[PDB]
Design a protein around this ligand. Structure first.
Ligand SMILES: CC[N+](CC)=C1CC[C@H]2C[C@H]([C@H](O)NCCOCCOCCN(C[C@@H]3CCCN(Cc4ccccc4)C3)S(=O)(=O)c3ccc4ccccc4c3)C(=O)C[C@@H]2C1
Ligand SMILES: *[C@@H]1O[C@H](CO[C@@H]2O[C@@H](C)[C@@H](O)[C@@H](O)[C@@H]2O)[C@@H](O[C@@H]2O[C@H](CO)[C@@H](O)[C@H](O)[C@H]2NC(C)=O)[C@H](O)[C@H]1NC(C)=O
Ligand SMILES: *[C@@H]1O[C@H](CO[C@H]2O[C@@H](C)[C@@H](O)[C@@H](O)[C@@H]2O)[C@@H](O[C@@H]2O[C@H](CO)[C@@H](O)[C@H](O)[C@H]2NC(C)=O)[C@H](O)[C@H]1NC(C)=O
Ligand SMILES: *[C@@H]1O[C@H](CO[C@H]2O[C@@H](C)[C@@H](O)[C@@H](O)[C@@H]2O)[C@@H](O[C@@H]2O[C@H](CO)[C@@H](O)[C@H](O)[C@H]2NC(C)=O)[C@H](O)[C@H]1NC(C)=O
Ligand SMILES: *[C@@H]1O[C@H](CO[C@H]2O[C@@H](C)[C@@H](O)[C@@H](O)[C@@H]2O)[C@@H](O[C@@H]2O[C@H](CO)[C@@H](O)[C@H](O)[C@H]2NC(C)=O)[C@H](O)[C@H]1NC(C)=O
Ligand SMILES: *[C@@H]1O[C@H](CO[C@H]2O[C@@H](C)[C@@H](O)[C@@H](O)[C@@H]2O)[C@@H](O[C@@H]2O[C@H](CO)[C@@H](O)[C@H](O)[C@H]2NC(C)=O)[C@H](O)[C@H]1NC(C)=O
Ligand SMILES: *[C@@H]1O[C@H](CO)[C@@H](O[C@@H]2O[C@H](CO)[C@@H](O)[C@H](O)[C@H]2NC(C)=O)[C@H](O)[C@H]1NC(C)=O
Ligand SMILES: *[C@@H]1O[C@H](CO)[C@@H](O[C@H]2O[C@H](CO)[C@@H](O)[C@H](O)[C@H]2NC(C)=O)[C@H](O)[C@H]1NC(C)=O
Ligand SMILES: *[C@H]1O[C@H](CO)[C@@H](O[C@@H]2O[C@H](CO)[C@@H](O)[C@H](O)[C@H]2NC(C)=O)[C@H](O)[C@H]1NC(C)=O
Ligand SMILES: *[C@@H]1O[C@H](CO[C@@H]2O[C@@H](C)[C@@H](O)[C@@H](O)[C@@H]2O)[C@@H](O)[C@H](O)[C@H]1NC(C)=O
Ligand SMILES: *[C@@H]1O[C@H](CO)[C@@H](O)[C@H](O)[C@H]1NC(C)=O
Ligand SMILES: *[C@@H]1O[C@H](CO)[C@@H](O)[C@H](O)[C@H]1NC(C)=O
Ligand SMILES: *[C@@H]1O[C@H](CO)[C@@H](O)[C@H](O)[C@H]1NC(C)=O
Ligand SMILES: *[C@@H]1O[C@H](CO)[C@@H](O)[C@H](O)[C@H]1NC(C)=O
Ligand SMILES: *[C@H]1O[C@H](CO)[C@@H](O)[C@H](O)[C@H]1NC(C)=O
Ligand SMILES: *[C@H]1O[C@H](CO)[C@@H](O)[C@H](O)[C@H]1NC(C)=O
Ligand SMILES: [Cl-]
Ligand SMILES: [Cl-]
Ligand SMILES: [Cl-]
Ligand SMILES: [Cl-]
Ligand SMILES: [Cl-]
Lengths: 527, 526
């Protein structure tokens, strides 16, 4: 029998067959009291011992969230939708241990993304069994409250203070500290990693002192807190909370009466009103997300970073080549996943209105000008690809580069990557390229399964990315081998060297899209 | 020796140039003196004189303000007039090879000076070397500048505008009716000029009255589509009424304003021209060409797009550092006597001086486009960016635009880019290859070996002198020497041009295209 004794009771696990070996899996371990009833909108309360044996034998419920039904039956959009039942009772975590049991393994802890409104740790592409089997690490993931139930903010009021989902994550990190040694893990070798809003979450754990003692190193894939979508200002969050009360019939005089009212609404009557709390919303609007709660985050994050008040440790950071294209099919005129999406100069200007609703006409013109210095003005696809780059540069690439730059200047080793490979099984059209979220299966080893119709070069790439990630976790260095391997050099603010990742040639390059990012760092804020 | 003009007889003189002889006629009158009741009117054709005119000395230069910013400094005073000033100034010069030629091509020079200054008798416009070395006839003329040449009340023949342009046209007319008596071919005539003279040349390409008076055109550092080249009818009227206010000539109708301005001492007109525009820059053109309904029937850019101009070959070019000259006449931190290192805040202050009507957003976009440094460390970055802003906007990018549009009508265009800094240049090294300092090479001054030029400068000057004369004679700026690079036509697709310098003359494409894309496709939207 597969049984491990946690400090909240015993828990029973499960054996998995992975590449002629065994991976012991505990799926759905609870880490907090279910945020039901009077605990709705509050920080996670710690758990009390249970008598029996908890059966960590299946994935648990995913936290309440709206679903993406833009393309029913499409694997491209539905692979991100939750694959378990939805419930407010969702604060569970999973653990993958290599077999035979290790004596002191390094732990990788995964924070999924989803714009702080969607996501779940039980998706097929976050399966930690391959990492555990191939690299001998313990892999941990946790479900955390998303949407208004996770990030509703009446700042200073304990009944709904903001950043609950971030505290959800942090309490899972407290569990790993208190419990992972019992499974074979080293609490002193813990690496957080995550993608998109999960990468923004990872970078926020670097700033928050409460998290500092709970992990060793960080990996940020396609996200960081200085992204334009990551953090809501103190009082914009409160004003979206009030608009939600009004939208549900919960506008009261004192705040505790608003929260008391919101607690009697059904989850689905809250979810159906979240989209409306912001007046003109981009396809990248974070309705309810992190805020300066004065508890998890004591100041706006850009200030803490500039003043050097953050955890001093090594970071691995990177972005994909076409981060932006995924968002053009969700509201830009002339874009479909089913045609080649060739657009015109005015269809471009209307695309910019969708993504920059508050920017002036002079500002929207300067953007268009910076992205229209064609190398071949005969190329029809010019405007289709220019708009994807604008969305990609402004929202993901340039902030991640600027975060790495600023972080590197305080004396800790940073590494930057450019993921350039398109999946051979990607369900989306060609014109979208190396999309947001499509390095994850390569990081989690899914191409190592040959039963899965992957190309041999993709297995070699995935095997290489898996080794580099797990080595960065163990040693603070993302090396593959000492010989027959490109040395991945440190990102330094002068040279700004990064490593590209693809099947043809992994190269050391410099100053990724500097001419583009110079626009967003040095001209766009002045507009 | 004496030659018979259709209006009288003129006596010349013999010049010994490089062992040979050049026959010069300096100071032939081509129009009645625009005095008293002819002030502000178009030039009137001249009456015959019975005796002999002695065209043996440079004539009076037209009334104009003098640059006295740097007293005793050759770099500025070499552009000041070197004959006495007077409204009696409509004379011209003629240089002829010796022995007398047969049917020689004529090069007619039109000087610049912002339509405010200039004379044909400057040392750097000496046509004796051009005649000796290439056996061409060289003609230059004086034309009225300032308000005395370009005061405009549109529709009124007492002050119609463009009077200085008609001065030039009447000199071109003189050449058609007299250059044969001298040995020249009236049907082989090439206009060339620099700056305001180049812009003037390009305006003769548009005006129908001038079409039959020349064959080809050379445009050095200037063209009519430059921001400084043409005053709109509105600002021309606002500047004419301001001048009357400043001289006590504010009247109720136009005819009386002109009667009053005709009785003002020339210095009282000259010394008020500076105050007619409130927000001026070092490139301000107080009184210049306008849409007069006569010399220009429409706005020049409209004429250009529509193809209503003289179709012929053109030779067009610019220098590398066109903008520097103007940075020492207003921009803060700049001086001819130090290295003029400036800061980002001082760069923002220079922009305000050259773009006084532009929003802070627009001035920000200029700044941003010119600060993508190749080397972030070099302290000369902002000094080089400002002179590049002034040069690109005012000279380089208009001249490229002109050549593209002109050539698209089936005309052979040739574009050059002058990169040589004169070893004798009196201005500091940071100003580089300044506006106006290719003229010595076009006119053959470095061919005088007793002059402190370098050997390479003599070689370079001979190449340009040859290419220029060949373009006039044949329509192709080829050089006869075997080792010379072949000069291709400028066309809209490939946009090929020829660099000029001592080292090696290359052939390049799309000159400064990245900078000029700002000035054509984004700046008119701020
Ligand atoms: C008055 N101006 C005085 C200028 C001040 C700057 C240039 N230097 C000549 C000079 C000095 C030093 C090296 C070369 C030349 C004299 S200007 O000659 O009339 C004038 C006005 C607008 C113009 C607009 C455009 C072009 C020329 C223009 C001339
Ligand atoms: C705070 O937010 C309010 C939002 O009021 C709105 O009402 C909600 C119920 C929801 O329907 C939102 O989409 C609405 O925008 C801002 O209010 C603005 O001014 C009036 C006031 O009600 C509103 O009708 C306008 O639509 C809002 N303006 C815009 C441009 O949408 C308010 O400005 C925000 N800030 C502050 C300080 O209160
Ligand atoms: C050593 O192994 C290489 C594989 O490794 C490459 O891996 C990249 C991540 C990067 O670090 C790079 O510097 C490094 O060279 C083998 O080379 C490959 O060889 C096969 C043929 O067997 C080719 O089909 C592959 O395209 C090629 N991959 C390349 C060049 O990236 C090779 O087995 C071995 N080479 C030597 C010299 O020992
Ligand atoms: C332009 O105006 C001049 C003069 O303007 C005169 O207008 C009058 C109303 C009056 O206020 C007077 O003080 C002012 O000077 C005209 O010349 C004038 O012609 C009239 C004959 O009709 C004479 O009686 C005036 O003495 C004479 N004035 C002068 C100064 O000579 C002129 O005719 C007029 N022309 C046009 C086209 O408007
Ligand atoms: C058209 O001309 C008017 C008249 O302006 C004055 O400017 C002085 C320097 C001087 O030449 C004087 O003789 C002349 O009267 C211009 O008007 C001025 O505009 C500025 C704003 O830029 C105001 O501050 C002034 O008060 C105003 N003056 C007057 C008398 O109204 C006007 O700007 C000009 N327009 C154009 C497009 O050139
Ligand atoms: C070519 O240069 C010589 C002298 O070379 C330079 O020497 C410098 C110290 C300075 O004097 C500078 O002016 C000069 O250019 C010129 O010869 C001298 O010119 C001055 C007047 O400018 C006469 O007074 C001298 O007698 C004369 N000869 C000397 C000093 O030996 C010469 O004029 C010049 N040529 C041209 C065309 O500029
Ligand atoms: C990757 O690089 C690290 C160095 O950053 C290597 O680390 C050492 O690893 C061994 C275990 O094999 C330890 O016993 C040492 O104490 C480590 N030293 C340091 C300074 O980190 C690691 O072995 C390398 N891995 C590969 C596959 O080359
Ligand atoms: C697991 O590895 C850690 C080291 O990461 C071991 O801890 C020791 O070394 C730490 C730093 O290198 C220090 O904290 C201590 O020296 C020590 N840790 C203690 C005393 O808690 C840890 O013992 C290992 N556990 C095993 C091998 O079972
Ligand atoms: C799960 O699989 C593991 C390994 O495949 C089983 O446990 C091991 O079984 C092997 C062979 O029977 C023994 O040599 C090891 O000593 C066992 N390890 C431990 C820790 O017991 C285990 O029986 C399987 N679980 C089941 C069948 O429930
Ligand atoms: C967990 O499941 C228990 C029964 O499952 C089984 O019995 C044990 C002894 C093992 O043999 C296991 O493989 C079987 O599947 C329940 O009795 C128990 O109540 C469950 N736990 C909870 C918390 O409900
Ligand atoms: C130069 O001088 C005389 C002067 O009459 C002129 O006619 C002739 O061209 C020249 N003399 C020669 C060439 O002997
Ligand atoms: C014409 O020029 C000659 C040349 O010296 C001179 O002798 C003669 O007096 C001049 N005639 C005039 C000025 O009438
Ligand atoms: C030269 O002059 C003659 C004189 O009649 C004229 O016919 C001819 O057209 C002119 N041009 C050339 C190129 O000969
Ligand atoms: C250059 O000289 C000018 C005028 O004397 C002065 O205003 C400027 O500050 C000086 N700059 C430098 C760098 O010497
Ligand atoms: C494809 O998407 C929609 C049609 O469903 C349309 O708006 C768009 O123009 C199409 N693209 C084409 C025809 O290129
Ligand atoms: C250039 O001059 C004319 C014009 O084409 C021509 O007769 C001559 O052969 C050309 N010479 C060279 C070297 O191109
Ligand atoms: Cl996602
Ligand atoms: Cl395509
Ligand atoms: Cl000049
Ligand atoms: Cl003007
Ligand atoms: Cl007078």
């Amino acid at each position: 029998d597969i049984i491990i004794a946690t400090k909240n009771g015993k828990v029973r696990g499960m054996n998995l067959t992975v590449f002629g070996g065994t991976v012991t899996a505990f799926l759905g371990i609870p880490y907090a009291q279910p945020p039901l009833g009077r605990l709705r909108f509050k920080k996670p309360q710690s758990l009390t011992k249970w008598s029996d044996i908890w059966n960590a034998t299946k994935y648990a419920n995913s936290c309440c969230q709206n679903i993406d039904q833009s393309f029913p039956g499409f694997h491209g959009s539905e692979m991100w939708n939750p694959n378990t039942d939805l419930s407010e009772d969702c604060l569970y975590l999973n653990v993958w241990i290599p077999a035979p049991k290790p004596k002191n393994a390094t732990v990788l802890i995964w924070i999924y993304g989803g714009g702080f409104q969607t996501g779940t740790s039980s998706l097929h592409v976050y399966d930690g069994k391959f990492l555990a089997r191939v690299e001998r690490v313990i892999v941990v993931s946790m479900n955390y409250r998303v949407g208004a139930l996770g990030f509703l903010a009446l700042p200073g009021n304990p009944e709904a203070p903001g950043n609950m989902g971030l505290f959800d994550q942090q309490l899972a990190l407290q569990w790993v500290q208190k419990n992972i040694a019992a499974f074979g893990g080293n609490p002193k070798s813990v690496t957080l990693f995550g993608e998109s809003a999960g990468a923004a979450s990872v970078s926020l754990h670097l700033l928050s002192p409460g998290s500092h003692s709970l992990f060793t190193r960080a990996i940020l894939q396609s996200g960081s807190f200085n992204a334009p979508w990551a953090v809501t200002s103190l009082y914009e969050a409160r004003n979206r909370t009030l608009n939600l009360a009004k939208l549900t019939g919960c506008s009261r005089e004192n705040e505790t009466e608003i929260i008391k009212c919101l607690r009697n609404k059904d989850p689905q009557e809250i979810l159906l009103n979240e989209a409306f709390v912001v007046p003109y919303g981009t396809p990248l609007s974070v309705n309810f997300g992190p805020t300066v709660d004065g508890d998890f985050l004591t100041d706006m994050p850009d200030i803490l970073l500039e003043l050097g008040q953050f955890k001093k440790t090594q970071i691995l950071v990177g972005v994909n080549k076409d981060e932006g294209t995924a968002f053009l099919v969700y509201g830009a005129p002339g874009f479909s996943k089913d045609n080649n999406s060739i657009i015109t100069r005015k269809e471009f200007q209307e695309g910019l209105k969708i993504f920059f609703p508050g920017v002036s006409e002079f500002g929207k013109e300067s953007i268009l000008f910076h992205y229209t210095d064609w190398v071949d003005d005969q190329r029809p696809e010019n405007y289709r690809e220019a708009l994807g780059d604008v969305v990609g540069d402004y929202n993901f690439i340039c902030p991640a580069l600027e975060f790495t730059k600023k972080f590197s200047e305080w004396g800790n080793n940073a590494f930057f990557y450019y993921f350039e490979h398109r999946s051979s099984k990607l369900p989306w059209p060609e014109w979208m390229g190396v999309m947001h979220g499509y390095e994850i299966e390569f990081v989690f080893g899914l191409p190592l399964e040959r039963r899965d119709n992957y190309t041999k070069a993709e297995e070699i790439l995935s095997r290489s990315i898996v080794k580099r990630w797990a080595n960065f976790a163990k040693y603070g260095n993302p090396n593959e081998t000492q010989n027959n391997s490109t040395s991945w050099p440190v990102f330094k603010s002068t040279e700004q060297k990064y490593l590209t990742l693809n099947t043809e040639s992994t190269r050391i390059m410099t100053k990724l899209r500097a001419q583009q990012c110079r626009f967003w760092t040095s001209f766009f804020p002045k507009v």
